[PDB]
């Protein structure tokens, strides 16, 4: 059959034609699969071996079955990533190799109860949660700083503003800094079809701040579409788990202190105003440090300003370089 060879050649030519075009968007993969093993790929032998919690950069459109993407890792070449429909099809194919999928067990009972598979055995049911196989995530993961005390208070304010100023000075002309006054912890996606479309209905949620939260969500999305690095100065995040399940899922940068005694002496050197909230700051620091480090993306145990600043510097540099 010359048709398969001809379509392979056409797809390849389109690949090197669009290799140097701007990227459209990006998504995240929450399932582990290999794009080289499947026989439905337009190009065979050039699949991507992505795993759970992986990111790809989609530039153009191919069909309702496959897309063209790029590996976020440094040196990643071109690859094909299946469409959400194709991913659902391969997920269904994953569990069809078993003896049974529905209710009728194969415990030495064959020929008596045929039990044809009902709708409960298919994907039509199980719609209570329906976690999407592909999520519309921002192209770049935003940079946020967490700890070691509450946001909006002195100790965290200085200890994060120093690093923000360092990043602004070192990345001049290629980075943008913005502050998100509105809340960001309620970045949900499957609450309702349209919660509070108009603000004049005077409903319970019409007069609330959900509209501002959503508007800031699309603002962050379109800002990340620009491919320019942007850090967040929002002072409404205080725990990795608050925004870990949301769509944004920012890069959590955790700064830590060896013992609470050092922090106690630090606030002891500030004044009585921070001494008043010393108790709540210690409580929040203890709660934040009880969390295992793997929840946070990067860790900063360095005592000195330089080591931490330059460390986040090469981390951001390699994140920028690997993306391109």
């Amino acid at each position: 059959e010359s048709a398969r060879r001809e379509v392979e050649s056409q797809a390849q030519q389109q690949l090197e034609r669009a290799k140097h075009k701007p990227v459209a968007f990006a998504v995240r993969t929450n399932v582990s699969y290999c794009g080289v093993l499947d026989e439905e790929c337009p190009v065979q032998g050039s699949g991507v071996n992505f795993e759970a919690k992986d990111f790809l950069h989609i530039k153009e459109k191919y069909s309702n079955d496959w897309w063209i993407g790029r590996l976020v890792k440094e040196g990643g070449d071109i690859a094909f990533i299946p469409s959400p429909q194709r991913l659902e099809s391969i997920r269904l194919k994953q569990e069809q190799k078993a003896r049974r999928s529905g209710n009728p067990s194969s415990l030495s009972d064959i020929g008596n109860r045929r039990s044809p598979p009902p709708s409960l055995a298919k994907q039509k049911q199980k719609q209570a949660e329906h976690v999407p196989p592909y999520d519309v995530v921002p192209s770049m993961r935003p940079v946020v700083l967490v700890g070691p005390s509450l946001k909006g208070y002195e100790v965290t304010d200085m200890m994060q503003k120093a690093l923000f100023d360092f990043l602004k000075h070192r990345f001049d002309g290629r980075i943008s800094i913005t502050r998100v006054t509105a809340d960001l912890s309620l970045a949900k996606r499957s609450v309702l079809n349209n919660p509070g479309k108009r603000t004049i209905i005077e409903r319970s949620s019409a007069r609330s701040s959900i509209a501002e939260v959503q508007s800031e969500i699309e603002r962050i999305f379109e800002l990340a579409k620009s491919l320019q690095l942007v850090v967040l100065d929002a002072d409404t995040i205080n725990h990795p788990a608050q925004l870990a399940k949301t769509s944004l899922a920012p890069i959590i940068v955790f700064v830590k202190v060896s013992s609470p005694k050092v922090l106690q002496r630090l606030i002891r050197s500030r004044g009585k105003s921070q001494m008043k909230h010393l108790t709540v700051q210690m409580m929040a620091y203890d709660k934040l440090v009880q969390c295992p480090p793997e929840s946070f993306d990067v860790i900063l145990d360095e005592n000195q300003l330089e080591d931490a600043c330059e460390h986040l510097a090469e981390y951001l540099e390699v994140y920028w370089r690997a993306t391109h």
């Binding site: 200890m159 120093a162 013992s259 050092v262």
Partner: peptide, 14 residues
């Protein structure tokens, strides 16, 4: 530890 943190909260914004 305090030596690297006392200046951290001093020359950053204060």
């Amino acid at each position: 530890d305090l030596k690297g943190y006392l200046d951290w909260i001093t020359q950053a914004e204060d």
